[PDB]
Amino acid sequence: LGEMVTVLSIDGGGIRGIIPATILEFLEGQLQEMDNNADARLADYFDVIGGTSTGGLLTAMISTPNENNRPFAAAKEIVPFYFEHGPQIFNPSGQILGPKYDGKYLMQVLQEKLGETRVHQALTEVVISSFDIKTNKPVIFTKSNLANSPELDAKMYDISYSTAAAPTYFPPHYFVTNTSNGDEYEFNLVDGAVATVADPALLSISVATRLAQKDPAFASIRSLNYKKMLLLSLGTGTTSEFDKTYTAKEAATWTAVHWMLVIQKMTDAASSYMTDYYLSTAFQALDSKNNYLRVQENALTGTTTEMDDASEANMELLVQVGENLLKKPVSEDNPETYEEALKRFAKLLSDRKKLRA
């Protein structure tokens, strides 16, 4: 157990980020309870924390240090963050041209809460995704790879805005860092979901796997031994109910405007199904299916399907979705609930930390 590598991964999903935040409030509460430490934080137990879009916002807030070199936010402060700032982040600009939101409020709250902190200060390994529309490549922010590429030591608010800058919802982000020679290095970034990692769990374990080649703390997973890997992957939900989906017949005459409204919800649901399929395949092949815990809601209904609905009523329904998800089974023909599997996961995180002491 002591040699095991621990990875947390949080999906994108706009305001639906309330669902994994509710799950993480439960998990961090279990850790605090079990280790008799009210200051226990997720970053004290996880070697790697990965997130895309609002999952990346969450990652930045629970891994960025405050003045006492402790995580900026407790997991129970995330849902209040969405209730307080969600309505102003998703306040329509009403501008004729451009995205639905001007992103000014989102930039300001991230600047306020993250200050001048840089990714090299992260209290654990972070994996925050984006897509660069200038270089036409994914740009993944981590602490590792800063040795070879120091221009990647961006500010946490630049990284956090960029990972969530969804095309047609927010404007793309432009910012600059400096290279080893002192030359300027520019970023032209959009949401990590465009990099196909709306679910970044496989990217997170790949970053951990590369680190195993150079960091002794990660040596146990060196040659793909995912038996020594604990992975918690959190979804923001999908839907398969006919009332929210489409037929090929109706879609025959859709123009680019209608397709742009649905293409990202489709690619994000696909990223959830495909990433989970790759990971389940890998963990099952090593008879280590229970090392991978995927907490996902598969029947979102009503207003909860919209990632930018920050109305008080919808946010309250998302808390209920997260609280109900805890009581749901981990799979069909397995009555183990998510709450029970998360208590089991907390116990492993706690025992591993005590083992490394």
mmCIF file of C-alpha atoms in Angstrom:
data_model
loop_
_atom_site.group_PDB
_atom_site.id
_atom_site.type_symbol
_atom_site.label_atom_id
_atom_site.label_comp_id
_atom_site.label_asym_id
_atom_site.label_seq_id
_atom_site.Cartn_x
_atom_site.Cartn_y
_atom_site.Cartn_z
ATOM 1 C CA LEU A 1 0.000 0.000 0.000
ATOM 2 C CA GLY A 2 2.865 2.392 0.909
ATOM 3 C CA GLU A 3 4.311 2.173 -2.616
ATOM 4 C CA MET A 4 0.943 2.984 -4.318
ATOM 5 C CA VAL A 5 0.474 6.129 -6.507
ATOM 6 C CA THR A 6 -2.756 8.151 -5.815
ATOM 7 C CA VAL A 7 -4.499 10.115 -8.573
ATOM 8 C CA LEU A 8 -7.614 12.326 -8.492
ATOM 9 C CA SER A 9 -9.312 13.374 -11.715
ATOM 10 C CA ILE A 10 -12.263 15.777 -12.106
ATOM 11 C CA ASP A 11 -14.266 16.114 -15.361
ATOM 12 C CA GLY A 12 -15.352 19.412 -16.986
ATOM 13 C CA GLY A 13 -19.051 20.355 -17.074
ATOM 14 C CA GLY A 14 -19.587 24.045 -16.244
ATOM 15 C CA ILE A 15 -21.977 24.582 -13.293
ATOM 16 C CA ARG A 16 -22.406 20.715 -13.058
ATOM 17 C CA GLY A 17 -19.005 20.947 -11.271
ATOM 18 C CA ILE A 18 -21.250 21.144 -8.140
ATOM 19 C CA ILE A 19 -21.701 17.322 -8.512
ATOM 20 C CA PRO A 20 -17.946 16.302 -8.117
ATOM 21 C CA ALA A 21 -17.535 19.166 -5.552
ATOM 22 C CA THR A 22 -20.327 17.509 -3.399
ATOM 23 C CA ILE A 23 -18.516 14.139 -3.763
ATOM 24 C CA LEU A 24 -15.140 15.701 -2.741
ATOM 25 C CA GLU A 25 -16.758 17.464 0.243
ATOM 26 C CA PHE A 26 -17.930 13.988 1.407
ATOM 27 C CA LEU A 27 -14.478 12.374 0.754
ATOM 28 C CA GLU A 28 -12.451 15.169 2.442
ATOM 29 C CA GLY A 29 -14.876 15.052 5.421
ATOM 30 C CA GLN A 30 -14.185 11.272 5.734
ATOM 31 C CA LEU A 31 -10.425 11.923 5.657
ATOM 32 C CA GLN A 32 -10.730 14.654 8.359
ATOM 33 C CA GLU A 33 -12.853 12.277 10.523
ATOM 34 C CA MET A 34 -10.605 9.182 10.114
ATOM 35 C CA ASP A 35 -7.262 11.030 10.734
ATOM 36 C CA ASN A 36 -8.573 13.291 13.599
ATOM 37 C CA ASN A 37 -7.474 16.395 11.710
ATOM 38 C CA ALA A 38 -10.072 19.066 10.754
ATOM 39 C CA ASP A 39 -7.377 20.653 8.500
ATOM 40 C CA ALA A 40 -6.915 17.420 6.416
ATOM 41 C CA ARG A 41 -6.994 18.256 2.689
ATOM 42 C CA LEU A 42 -7.275 16.241 -0.565
ATOM 43 C CA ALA A 43 -3.791 17.540 -1.685
ATOM 44 C CA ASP A 44 -2.282 15.810 1.451
ATOM 45 C CA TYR A 45 -3.411 12.346 0.124
ATOM 46 C CA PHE A 46 -3.298 12.606 -3.702
ATOM 47 C CA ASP A 47 0.047 12.582 -5.634
ATOM 48 C CA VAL A 48 -1.657 13.842 -8.819
ATOM 49 C CA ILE A 49 -4.802 16.057 -9.208
ATOM 50 C CA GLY A 50 -6.150 16.455 -12.751
ATOM 51 C CA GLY A 51 -9.024 18.568 -14.002
ATOM 52 C CA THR A 52 -10.498 20.072 -17.148
ATOM 53 C CA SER A 53 -12.579 23.278 -17.253
ATOM 54 C CA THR A 54 -14.539 23.623 -13.910
ATOM 55 C CA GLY A 55 -12.718 20.412 -12.856
ATOM 56 C CA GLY A 56 -9.496 22.383 -13.505
ATOM 57 C CA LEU A 57 -10.883 25.404 -11.554
ATOM 58 C CA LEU A 58 -11.497 23.016 -8.632
ATOM 59 C CA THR A 59 -7.975 21.488 -9.051
ATOM 60 C CA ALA A 60 -6.386 24.972 -8.971
ATOM 61 C CA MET A 61 -8.256 25.954 -5.794
ATOM 62 C CA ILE A 62 -7.495 22.727 -3.789
ATOM 63 C CA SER A 63 -3.784 22.498 -4.926
ATOM 64 C CA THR A 64 -2.697 26.209 -4.858
ATOM 65 C CA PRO A 65 -1.008 27.259 -1.557
ATOM 66 C CA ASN A 66 -2.176 30.070 0.705
ATOM 67 C CA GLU A 67 0.180 32.145 2.966
ATOM 68 C CA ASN A 68 0.625 29.101 5.362
ATOM 69 C CA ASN A 69 1.607 26.814 2.391
ATOM 70 C CA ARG A 70 -1.734 24.970 2.886
ATOM 71 C CA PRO A 71 -4.368 24.363 0.119
ATOM 72 C CA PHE A 72 -6.281 27.597 -0.690
ATOM 73 C CA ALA A 73 -9.697 25.904 -0.521
ATOM 74 C CA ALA A 74 -11.238 23.144 1.597
ATOM 75 C CA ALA A 75 -13.447 20.778 -0.439
ATOM 76 C CA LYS A 76 -16.553 22.102 1.505
ATOM 77 C CA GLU A 77 -15.800 25.656 0.214
ATOM 78 C CA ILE A 78 -16.225 24.641 -3.477
ATOM 79 C CA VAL A 79 -20.066 24.284 -3.636
ATOM 80 C CA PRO A 80 -20.435 27.722 -1.813
ATOM 81 C CA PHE A 81 -17.987 29.076 -4.503
ATOM 82 C CA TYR A 82 -20.382 27.957 -7.293
ATOM 83 C CA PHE A 83 -23.501 29.315 -5.465
ATOM 84 C CA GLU A 84 -21.851 32.713 -4.815
ATOM 85 C CA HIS A 85 -19.922 33.196 -8.113
ATOM 86 C CA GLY A 86 -21.726 30.836 -10.557
ATOM 87 C CA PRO A 87 -24.575 33.350 -11.285
ATOM 88 C CA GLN A 88 -22.044 36.141 -12.128
ATOM 89 C CA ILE A 89 -19.658 33.828 -14.120
ATOM 90 C CA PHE A 90 -22.656 32.745 -16.237
ATOM 91 C CA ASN A 91 -24.263 36.224 -16.555
ATOM 92 C CA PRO A 92 -25.050 36.656 -20.352
ATOM 93 C CA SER A 93 -23.193 39.625 -21.914
ATOM 94 C CA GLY A 94 -26.027 40.175 -24.438
ATOM 95 C CA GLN A 95 -23.369 41.262 -27.010
ATOM 96 C CA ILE A 96 -24.505 40.710 -30.625
ATOM 97 C CA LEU A 97 -21.159 39.177 -31.666
ATOM 98 C CA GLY A 98 -18.942 36.779 -29.754
ATOM 99 C CA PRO A 99 -19.518 34.267 -26.965
ATOM 100 C CA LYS A 100 -22.489 33.997 -24.566
ATOM 101 C CA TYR A 101 -20.307 35.332 -21.673
ATOM 102 C CA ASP A 102 -17.562 37.941 -21.810
ATOM 103 C CA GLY A 103 -15.478 36.004 -19.248
ATOM 104 C CA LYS A 104 -14.655 39.233 -17.348
ATOM 105 C CA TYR A 105 -16.254 38.018 -14.078
ATOM 106 C CA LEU A 106 -14.616 34.538 -14.419
ATOM 107 C CA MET A 107 -11.129 36.158 -14.899
ATOM 108 C CA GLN A 108 -11.658 38.568 -11.929
ATOM 109 C CA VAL A 109 -12.776 35.901 -9.384
ATOM 110 C CA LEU A 110 -9.862 33.590 -10.392
ATOM 111 C CA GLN A 111 -7.401 36.533 -10.058
ATOM 112 C CA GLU A 112 -8.919 37.382 -6.611
ATOM 113 C CA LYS A 113 -8.845 33.824 -5.260
ATOM 114 C CA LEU A 114 -5.533 32.655 -6.810
ATOM 115 C CA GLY A 115 -3.434 35.878 -6.573
ATOM 116 C CA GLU A 116 0.004 35.789 -8.273
ATOM 117 C CA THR A 117 0.546 32.033 -7.673
ATOM 118 C CA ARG A 118 2.249 29.961 -10.397
ATOM 119 C CA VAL A 119 1.928 26.247 -11.258
ATOM 120 C CA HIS A 120 5.463 25.515 -9.762
ATOM 121 C CA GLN A 121 3.978 26.330 -6.278
ATOM 122 C CA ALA A 122 1.216 23.650 -6.513
ATOM 123 C CA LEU A 123 1.168 21.487 -3.350
ATOM 124 C CA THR A 124 0.868 18.330 -5.440
ATOM 125 C CA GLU A 125 1.268 17.367 -9.087
ATOM 126 C CA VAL A 126 -1.503 19.118 -11.066
ATOM 127 C CA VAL A 127 -2.715 18.266 -14.602
ATOM 128 C CA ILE A 128 -4.730 21.116 -16.107
ATOM 129 C CA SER A 129 -5.674 20.944 -19.790
ATOM 130 C CA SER A 130 -6.168 23.407 -22.642
ATOM 131 C CA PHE A 131 -5.976 23.545 -26.420
ATOM 132 C CA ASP A 132 -3.791 26.172 -28.147
ATOM 133 C CA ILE A 133 -5.601 27.523 -31.274
ATOM 134 C CA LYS A 134 -2.334 29.187 -32.557
ATOM 135 C CA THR A 135 0.010 26.158 -32.294
ATOM 136 C CA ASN A 136 -2.986 23.843 -32.973
ATOM 137 C CA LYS A 137 -1.932 21.587 -30.066
ATOM 138 C CA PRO A 138 -3.119 20.619 -26.577
ATOM 139 C CA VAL A 139 -1.264 22.540 -23.813
ATOM 140 C CA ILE A 140 -1.200 20.587 -20.509
ATOM 141 C CA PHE A 141 -0.031 22.463 -17.405
ATOM 142 C CA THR A 142 1.906 20.350 -14.833
ATOM 143 C CA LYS A 143 4.838 20.816 -12.307
ATOM 144 C CA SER A 144 6.754 18.012 -14.093
ATOM 145 C CA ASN A 145 7.963 19.081 -17.607
ATOM 146 C CA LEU A 146 8.745 22.564 -16.039
ATOM 147 C CA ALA A 147 12.426 21.406 -15.935
ATOM 148 C CA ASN A 148 12.577 20.990 -19.750
ATOM 149 C CA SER A 149 10.051 23.778 -20.465
ATOM 150 C CA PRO A 150 10.065 26.662 -17.860
ATOM 151 C CA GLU A 151 7.872 28.859 -20.159
ATOM 152 C CA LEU A 152 5.054 26.540 -18.937
ATOM 153 C CA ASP A 153 5.248 28.072 -15.411
ATOM 154 C CA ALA A 154 2.091 30.139 -16.004
ATOM 155 C CA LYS A 155 -0.026 31.956 -13.404
ATOM 156 C CA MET A 156 -2.797 29.825 -11.839
ATOM 157 C CA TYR A 157 -5.521 32.317 -12.876
ATOM 158 C CA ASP A 158 -4.310 32.234 -16.570
ATOM 159 C CA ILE A 159 -4.341 28.361 -16.516
ATOM 160 C CA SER A 160 -7.733 28.211 -14.674
ATOM 161 C CA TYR A 161 -9.490 30.666 -17.024
ATOM 162 C CA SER A 162 -7.985 28.910 -20.119
ATOM 163 C CA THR A 163 -9.006 25.362 -19.094
ATOM 164 C CA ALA A 164 -12.654 26.635 -18.805
ATOM 165 C CA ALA A 165 -12.676 28.984 -21.888
ATOM 166 C CA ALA A 166 -15.301 26.954 -23.821
ATOM 167 C CA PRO A 167 -15.774 28.075 -27.490
ATOM 168 C CA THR A 168 -19.076 30.113 -27.911
ATOM 169 C CA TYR A 169 -19.400 30.371 -24.051
ATOM 170 C CA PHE A 170 -16.273 32.427 -23.217
ATOM 171 C CA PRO A 171 -13.616 34.224 -25.298
ATOM 172 C CA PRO A 172 -10.303 32.394 -25.884
ATOM 173 C CA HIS A 173 -7.476 33.509 -23.547
ATOM 174 C CA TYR A 174 -4.201 35.251 -24.472
ATOM 175 C CA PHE A 175 -1.261 35.516 -22.054
ATOM 176 C CA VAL A 176 2.550 35.408 -22.081
ATOM 177 C CA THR A 177 5.355 33.805 -19.985
ATOM 178 C CA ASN A 178 9.168 33.929 -20.459
ATOM 179 C CA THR A 179 11.540 31.173 -21.827
ATOM 180 C CA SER A 180 15.036 30.217 -20.419
ATOM 181 C CA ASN A 181 16.650 32.890 -22.722
ATOM 182 C CA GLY A 182 14.160 35.522 -21.442
ATOM 183 C CA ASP A 183 12.224 35.517 -24.761
ATOM 184 C CA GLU A 184 8.387 35.874 -24.695
ATOM 185 C CA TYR A 185 6.218 32.707 -24.946
ATOM 186 C CA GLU A 186 2.558 33.196 -25.889
ATOM 187 C CA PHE A 187 -0.548 31.122 -25.201
ATOM 188 C CA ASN A 188 -3.816 31.353 -27.221
ATOM 189 C CA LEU A 189 -6.011 28.934 -25.307
ATOM 190 C CA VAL A 190 -9.482 27.423 -25.212
ATOM 191 C CA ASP A 191 -11.138 24.845 -22.874
ATOM 192 C CA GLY A 192 -9.397 21.495 -22.259
ATOM 193 C CA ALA A 193 -12.528 19.724 -23.622
ATOM 194 C CA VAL A 194 -11.366 20.889 -27.092
ATOM 195 C CA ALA A 195 -8.133 18.875 -26.375
ATOM 196 C CA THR A 196 -10.588 15.811 -26.092
ATOM 197 C CA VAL A 197 -9.942 15.533 -22.316
ATOM 198 C CA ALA A 198 -13.341 16.696 -20.838
ATOM 199 C CA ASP A 199 -12.588 13.523 -18.778
ATOM 200 C CA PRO A 200 -8.812 13.876 -18.008
ATOM 201 C CA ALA A 201 -8.406 10.664 -15.912
ATOM 202 C CA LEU A 202 -6.267 8.793 -18.523
ATOM 203 C CA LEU A 203 -4.168 11.936 -19.138
ATOM 204 C CA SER A 204 -3.677 12.189 -15.318
ATOM 205 C CA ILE A 205 -2.467 8.543 -15.014
ATOM 206 C CA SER A 206 -0.227 9.040 -18.172
ATOM 207 C CA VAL A 207 1.449 12.067 -16.454
ATOM 208 C CA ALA A 208 1.898 9.901 -13.301
ATOM 209 C CA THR A 209 3.338 7.062 -15.550
ATOM 210 C CA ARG A 210 5.905 9.478 -17.204
ATOM 211 C CA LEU A 211 6.864 10.761 -13.696
ATOM 212 C CA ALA A 212 7.569 7.099 -12.662
ATOM 213 C CA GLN A 213 10.495 7.192 -15.160
ATOM 214 C CA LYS A 214 12.211 10.096 -13.298
ATOM 215 C CA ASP A 215 10.663 10.422 -9.754
ATOM 216 C CA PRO A 216 11.329 7.628 -7.148
ATOM 217 C CA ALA A 217 8.039 8.457 -5.301
ATOM 218 C CA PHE A 218 6.214 7.167 -8.469
ATOM 219 C CA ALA A 219 8.566 4.133 -9.120
ATOM 220 C CA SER A 220 5.901 1.493 -8.191
ATOM 221 C CA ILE A 221 3.886 2.190 -11.408
ATOM 222 C CA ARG A 222 7.141 2.229 -13.598
ATOM 223 C CA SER A 223 6.192 -0.513 -16.153
ATOM 224 C CA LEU A 224 2.335 0.004 -16.281
ATOM 225 C CA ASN A 225 1.746 -1.818 -12.997
ATOM 226 C CA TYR A 226 -1.653 -0.158 -12.335
ATOM 227 C CA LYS A 227 -2.086 -2.692 -9.446
ATOM 228 C CA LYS A 228 -0.021 -0.078 -7.481
ATOM 229 C CA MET A 229 -2.213 2.795 -8.724
ATOM 230 C CA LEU A 230 -5.324 4.214 -6.991
ATOM 231 C CA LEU A 231 -7.512 6.346 -9.246
ATOM 232 C CA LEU A 232 -10.586 8.357 -8.320
ATOM 233 C CA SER A 233 -12.272 9.808 -11.431
ATOM 234 C CA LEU A 234 -15.271 12.125 -10.944
ATOM 235 C CA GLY A 235 -17.893 12.925 -13.554
ATOM 236 C CA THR A 236 -20.300 15.895 -13.873
ATOM 237 C CA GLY A 237 -22.970 13.655 -15.397
ATOM 238 C CA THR A 238 -24.416 12.665 -18.749
ATOM 239 C CA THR A 239 -27.906 11.942 -20.034
ATOM 240 C CA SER A 240 -29.328 9.140 -22.234
ATOM 241 C CA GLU A 241 -33.052 10.084 -21.862
ATOM 242 C CA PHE A 242 -34.782 10.595 -25.307
ATOM 243 C CA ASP A 243 -36.295 13.979 -24.248
ATOM 244 C CA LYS A 244 -32.758 15.500 -24.170
ATOM 245 C CA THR A 245 -31.296 13.640 -27.195
ATOM 246 C CA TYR A 246 -31.842 13.626 -31.001
ATOM 247 C CA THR A 247 -32.750 11.604 -34.073
ATOM 248 C CA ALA A 248 -30.858 11.401 -37.402
ATOM 249 C CA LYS A 249 -34.177 12.380 -39.117
ATOM 250 C CA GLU A 250 -34.577 15.712 -37.291
ATOM 251 C CA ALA A 251 -30.803 16.505 -37.616
ATOM 252 C CA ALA A 252 -30.784 16.133 -41.490
ATOM 253 C CA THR A 253 -31.505 19.894 -41.996
ATOM 254 C CA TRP A 254 -29.506 21.333 -39.008
ATOM 255 C CA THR A 255 -27.213 24.196 -39.938
ATOM 256 C CA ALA A 256 -23.838 25.042 -38.309
ATOM 257 C CA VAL A 257 -25.577 27.180 -35.625
ATOM 258 C CA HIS A 258 -27.591 24.216 -34.232
ATOM 259 C CA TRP A 259 -24.601 21.817 -34.548
ATOM 260 C CA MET A 260 -22.348 24.221 -32.571
ATOM 261 C CA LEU A 261 -24.952 24.259 -29.745
ATOM 262 C CA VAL A 262 -24.752 20.446 -29.274
ATOM 263 C CA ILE A 263 -21.312 19.253 -30.611
ATOM 264 C CA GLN A 264 -19.436 19.972 -27.355
ATOM 265 C CA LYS A 265 -22.069 18.198 -25.122
ATOM 266 C CA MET A 266 -21.732 15.146 -27.466
ATOM 267 C CA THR A 267 -17.884 15.175 -27.550
ATOM 268 C CA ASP A 268 -17.857 15.619 -23.708
ATOM 269 C CA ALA A 269 -20.262 12.662 -23.126
ATOM 270 C CA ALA A 270 -18.076 10.654 -25.595
ATOM 271 C CA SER A 271 -14.885 11.675 -23.689
ATOM 272 C CA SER A 272 -16.546 10.316 -20.468
ATOM 273 C CA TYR A 273 -17.536 6.943 -22.123
ATOM 274 C CA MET A 274 -14.244 6.448 -24.082
ATOM 275 C CA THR A 275 -11.834 7.410 -21.220
ATOM 276 C CA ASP A 276 -13.770 5.165 -18.773
ATOM 277 C CA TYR A 277 -13.641 2.328 -21.364
ATOM 278 C CA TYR A 278 -9.805 2.661 -21.780
ATOM 279 C CA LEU A 279 -9.265 2.744 -17.975
ATOM 280 C CA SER A 280 -11.702 -0.122 -17.147
ATOM 281 C CA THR A 281 -9.943 -2.199 -19.889
ATOM 282 C CA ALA A 282 -6.500 -1.519 -18.341
ATOM 283 C CA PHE A 283 -7.428 -2.089 -14.645
ATOM 284 C CA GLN A 284 -9.424 -5.261 -15.508
ATOM 285 C CA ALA A 285 -6.466 -6.668 -17.493
ATOM 286 C CA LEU A 286 -4.393 -6.448 -14.250
ATOM 287 C CA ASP A 287 -7.306 -7.890 -12.125
ATOM 288 C CA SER A 288 -7.327 -4.455 -10.324
ATOM 289 C CA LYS A 289 -10.828 -3.180 -11.202
ATOM 290 C CA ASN A 290 -11.422 -1.850 -7.661
ATOM 291 C CA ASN A 291 -8.286 0.439 -7.826
ATOM 292 C CA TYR A 292 -10.294 2.565 -10.303
ATOM 293 C CA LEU A 293 -13.362 4.316 -8.851
ATOM 294 C CA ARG A 294 -15.417 6.244 -11.414
ATOM 295 C CA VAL A 295 -18.198 8.326 -9.782
ATOM 296 C CA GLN A 296 -20.585 9.268 -12.565
ATOM 297 C CA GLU A 297 -24.303 10.301 -12.817
ATOM 298 C CA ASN A 298 -25.808 8.720 -15.953
ATOM 299 C CA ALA A 299 -29.416 10.042 -15.840
ATOM 300 C CA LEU A 300 -29.358 13.918 -15.710
ATOM 301 C CA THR A 301 -32.861 15.354 -16.310
ATOM 302 C CA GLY A 302 -34.567 18.772 -16.564
ATOM 303 C CA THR A 303 -32.494 21.936 -16.193
ATOM 304 C CA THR A 304 -29.405 20.011 -14.833
ATOM 305 C CA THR A 305 -28.278 19.023 -18.365
ATOM 306 C CA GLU A 306 -27.290 22.698 -19.108
ATOM 307 C CA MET A 307 -23.709 23.487 -18.014
ATOM 308 C CA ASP A 308 -24.315 27.271 -17.829
ATOM 309 C CA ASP A 309 -27.585 27.293 -15.851
ATOM 310 C CA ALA A 310 -26.491 29.019 -12.633
ATOM 311 C CA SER A 311 -30.038 29.770 -11.381
ATOM 312 C CA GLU A 312 -30.495 29.187 -7.624
ATOM 313 C CA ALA A 313 -33.041 26.367 -8.372
ATOM 314 C CA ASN A 314 -30.745 24.543 -10.827
ATOM 315 C CA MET A 315 -27.738 24.778 -8.462
ATOM 316 C CA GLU A 316 -29.920 23.300 -5.655
ATOM 317 C CA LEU A 317 -30.946 20.455 -8.025
ATOM 318 C CA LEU A 318 -27.226 19.772 -8.750
ATOM 319 C CA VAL A 319 -26.457 19.510 -4.949
ATOM 320 C CA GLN A 320 -29.366 16.973 -4.771
ATOM 321 C CA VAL A 321 -27.885 15.081 -7.769
ATOM 322 C CA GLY A 322 -24.499 14.877 -5.932
ATOM 323 C CA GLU A 323 -26.102 13.874 -2.594
ATOM 324 C CA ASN A 324 -28.259 11.225 -4.358
ATOM 325 C CA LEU A 325 -25.242 9.960 -6.366
ATOM 326 C CA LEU A 326 -23.545 9.019 -3.053
ATOM 327 C CA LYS A 327 -26.445 6.594 -2.318
ATOM 328 C CA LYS A 328 -26.431 5.059 -5.855
ATOM 329 C CA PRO A 329 -24.781 1.665 -6.691
ATOM 330 C CA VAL A 330 -21.264 1.666 -8.237
ATOM 331 C CA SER A 331 -22.632 -0.631 -11.040
ATOM 332 C CA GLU A 332 -25.557 -2.910 -11.990
ATOM 333 C CA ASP A 333 -25.727 -6.198 -10.009
ATOM 334 C CA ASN A 334 -23.370 -4.614 -7.335
ATOM 335 C CA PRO A 335 -25.216 -2.975 -4.397
ATOM 336 C CA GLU A 336 -21.990 -1.207 -3.161
ATOM 337 C CA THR A 337 -22.957 2.476 -3.061
ATOM 338 C CA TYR A 338 -20.670 5.339 -4.132
ATOM 339 C CA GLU A 339 -20.557 6.519 -0.443
ATOM 340 C CA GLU A 340 -19.333 3.068 0.662
ATOM 341 C CA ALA A 341 -16.683 2.851 -2.118
ATOM 342 C CA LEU A 342 -15.542 6.436 -1.225
ATOM 343 C CA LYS A 343 -15.236 5.488 2.511
ATOM 344 C CA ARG A 344 -13.109 2.492 1.339
ATOM 345 C CA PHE A 345 -11.071 4.858 -0.921
ATOM 346 C CA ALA A 346 -10.612 7.354 2.035
ATOM 347 C CA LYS A 347 -9.322 4.532 4.261
ATOM 348 C CA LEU A 348 -6.720 3.558 1.585
ATOM 349 C CA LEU A 349 -5.613 7.225 1.220
ATOM 350 C CA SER A 350 -5.344 7.512 5.051
ATOM 351 C CA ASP A 351 -3.422 4.192 5.483
ATOM 352 C CA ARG A 352 -1.012 5.078 2.633
ATOM 353 C CA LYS A 353 -0.237 8.525 4.173
ATOM 354 C CA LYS A 354 0.420 6.902 7.655
ATOM 355 C CA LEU A 355 2.651 4.254 5.919
ATOM 356 C CA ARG A 356 4.747 7.066 4.317
ATOM 357 C CA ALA A 357 5.247 8.602 7.831
#
